[PDB]
Design a protein around this ligand. Sequence first.
Ligand SMILES: [Zn+2]
Ligand SMILES: [Zn+2]
Lengths: 58, 114, 89, 111, 49
Amino acid sequence: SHTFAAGPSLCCVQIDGKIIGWVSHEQGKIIADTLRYWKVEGKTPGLPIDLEIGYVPP
Amino acid sequence: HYGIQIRSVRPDQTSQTNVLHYLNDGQVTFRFSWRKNEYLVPVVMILKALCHTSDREIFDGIIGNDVKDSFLTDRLELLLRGFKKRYPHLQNRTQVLQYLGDKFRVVFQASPDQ
Amino acid sequence: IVMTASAAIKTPQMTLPIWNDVSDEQADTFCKSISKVLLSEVIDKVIVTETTGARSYVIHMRFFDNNEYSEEYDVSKEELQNVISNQFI
Amino acid sequence: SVVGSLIFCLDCGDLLENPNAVLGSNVECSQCKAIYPKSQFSNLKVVTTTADDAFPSSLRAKKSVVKTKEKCPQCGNEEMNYHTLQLRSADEGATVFYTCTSCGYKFRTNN
Amino acid sequence: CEFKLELAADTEKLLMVNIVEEICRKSIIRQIPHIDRCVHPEPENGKRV
Ligand SMILES: [Zn+2]
Ligand SMILES: [Zn+2]
């Protein structure tokens, strides 16, 4: 809602085809490694093991 | 030969593709198919029909902080001025959306009440 | 060959018999004089510059160094000027 | 509001007209219909270098290439399978997840 | 090689790089007609080819 961002210089975070937000290429790999670490360690109550997290690096 | 293509599915698991084409003139084209024939719409007609937009907010949604990228700025000159050239009317959202309903009324099998 | 008998052949060639007099050095500087040289093959980059408000353009086509393409394509400095003068524009 | 070769309104953000196709001394918007004078719109300069790969040649290809242990305490093993992984942010240290093969004991390391 | 190129103010925007690139690939410095390349291969079966 308040991002002012576009283009390949960022990585666009999308869930099921809608923009959730925008974050850096370096941070967008860091926040894609927790989303695998917390989906496998089934203690976070919002992340299923069924989830597919596709990080396309720059 | 360029273009982009999404296959959007509905929550009842029924699909609808929305192919965007790139024209060598500089403008782009939204393509869909309601029945077994295809239909072509310029996307600025749809960018101004989805929500109440400015014309810098169409610019700021493609151009991020890379204003100095003069490839993108020249191709977006031709996209937004081609909408003003071909459609000198249709200035706000409620007027673009009546043009889009007048052209797709007999093909979408609309009702006389709407 | 057989089925279509195409005069618009896909990849035509032509075999040329080198004489015994001309050596391998006189034959490969010879094939640089037959093979075509595009203007695209000599340009490093082209920097246009448009200032409007009469729409102006500053077409600045930057080549490689003269020691680099007069060896590679056997194109002289003055012959490259005549292509821009009489053919490119 | 002047970016590149295009000018916008300062009220509704609508793309203004090209000042070299309007009657003189005034550029007018189409929605707010604000008054922008044709002055102080002086340098609409835009440079566009070519596509950097637009001209394939045998010469362009030449200038590109001529440029020139852990000691696991459970049973004792030095070859121990590890994998560093930065979890939450770049502020903290990278967690090194250790996994043995001679015994199979696993542990991690903050620092 | 730099050359100025003016136009009228009535005209709208041309790209003028996709134009120049397509013209630079069609302009020829030197060409024998209907021949695009001439290769000196290795001598197959004695004769010089
Ligand atoms: Zn305005
Ligand atoms: Zn061990």
